Design a protein around this ligand. Structure first.
Ligand code: HEM
Length: 117
């Protein structure tokens, strides 16, 4: 069983990513980083990245997490906000706390790759 399957597979991921962006783009700590972002493109990259990271098909062709956030000098409070919004998204979509934690635990390894770049 992969975390991707536990979350409900492809239709669940396609629902979760725009709901995660709806919470990110409402969060004072991080919404402004997206001011000039093409959000259709970013929906596709982020769906492909999370799907690959959580054990679904690997079709991610984007940048690595240092390149993706290069020159943003992101701080720990920004990464906490992204995790909090993904957790709130998956909870609103009916995922149990155990599965949200498994997913967060994988994503958390990316923190050192993108902070302070
Ligand atoms: C730490 C707070 C974070 C902020 C403020 C943030 C913000 C951003 C922004 C502004 C861009 C794109 C610049 C543009 O193309 O318009 C980007 C690219 C990306 N971010 Fe983040 N991100 C953060 C954390 C995360 C996390 C935790 C992940 C994955 C778990 C992630 C995955 C990505 C991916 C896949 C891209 C796309 C790279 C590509 O287009 O090739 N980010 N991010």
């Amino acid at each position: 069983q992969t975390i991707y399957e536990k979350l409900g597979g492809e239709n669940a991921m396609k629902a979760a990513v725009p709901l995660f962006f709806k919470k990110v783009l409402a969060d004072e700590r991080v919404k402004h980083f997206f001011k000039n972002t093409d959000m259709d493109h970013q929906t596709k990259q982020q769906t492909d990245f999370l799907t690959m990271l959580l054990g679904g098909p690997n079709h991610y062709k984007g940048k690595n997490m240092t390149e993706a956030h290069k020159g943003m000098n992101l701080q720990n409070l920004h990464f906490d906000a992204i995790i909090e919004n993904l957790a709130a998204t998956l909870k609103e979509l009916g995922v149990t706390d155990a599965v949200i934690n498994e997913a967060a635990k994988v994503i958390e390894h990316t923190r050192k790759d993108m902070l302070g770049k």
